[PDB]
Design a binder for these strands. Sequence first.
DNA 1: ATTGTCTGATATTCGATTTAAGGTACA
DNA 2: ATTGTACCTTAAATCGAATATCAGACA
Lengths: 180, 177
Amino acid sequence: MRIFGYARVSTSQQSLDIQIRALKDAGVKANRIFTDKADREGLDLLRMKVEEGDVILVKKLDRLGRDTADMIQLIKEFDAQGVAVRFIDDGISTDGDMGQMVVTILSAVAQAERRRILERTNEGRQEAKLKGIKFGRRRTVDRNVVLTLHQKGTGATEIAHQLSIARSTVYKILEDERAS
Amino acid sequence: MRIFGYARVSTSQQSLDIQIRALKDAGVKANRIFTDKASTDREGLDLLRMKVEEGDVILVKKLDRLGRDTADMIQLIKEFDAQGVAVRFIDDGISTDGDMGQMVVTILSAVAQAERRRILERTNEGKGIKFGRRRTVDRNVVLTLHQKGTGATEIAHQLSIARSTVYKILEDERASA
DNA sequence: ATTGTCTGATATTCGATTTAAGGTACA
DNA sequence: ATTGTACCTTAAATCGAATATCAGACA
């Protein structure tokens, strides 16, 4: 249950001190803190060090990933590992009770805004399906060859060898056309 | 206590009705449903803004269907939570009310002000999903050759690319500089 | 016979989803 | 050693927007 902390800036040194000053004042040992500037290298170091159960403190969200997406990415990566993160100024934890409440949500957000880019695409799809464009893989096996052989009384396992397809395929093909 | 719903697309009617049909199955009366499509014609979402009253609640199928981006989306919710208006998303199972309802708005207020603060970082100096064909051509190779005085067509035959590509590769590196 | 410049056609590439076929497991 | 049957994994293929390369035309 080690206590680690992270800060980042783009340029400024001074704001990098205020973060570290806040973090030590949070009972973070000096050797437990990592930083970055404009070179993500220290973050990577942190990715390495952390073991399950360890917890990391950050000033604000904006100091974590380079953007709203990356930020979520990293947290997800850390709760994958059973790590927990706690933000100070905004007062938030990926552990405890809200621990699940928290990451339930940052998931939806990312995946939402992802879905928003594709908004046009995935919609152009719904319309295509409407039109009756066929989806999925294209049928590579002759459904007439198979139905004929089984009409004659030829068996599954043989038809399987004959056409060099799987057997379970042949119980599938018959199921489909005997349904329709 | 009233129940409303909102639905939003770009063009498709079909992906809209999918949302409407799912909002009627969620028990929203037909007149209580508003829509939009892309100009920024937000008319539906505005009309809604007007009609809700404290305690009334709005249903949206998925988060992506509220704002034009992550900001617009959060901006709107705070605005509703300010009125005692609650928003509930079906398919993601999230609400601004009930128990975790506060814990929901509390954090969303963090990212806005987190990313408001990111917008201010970029601004002073100046999509995330990669798309499109990968570069199969080494650029370093084309740069050095033309730098040495190798003509356009000599490089194109050397690396089995088209000449016209040779010029694209040059124009790109030139604007970057 | 090549050189610049430009426009148009091909060719991939994404994410979430939708079907086709392969493969195991069991009675 | 085969037969049904039920699920679980892969394997292509879907849309439109985005990016790269190709293939020529014209001066």
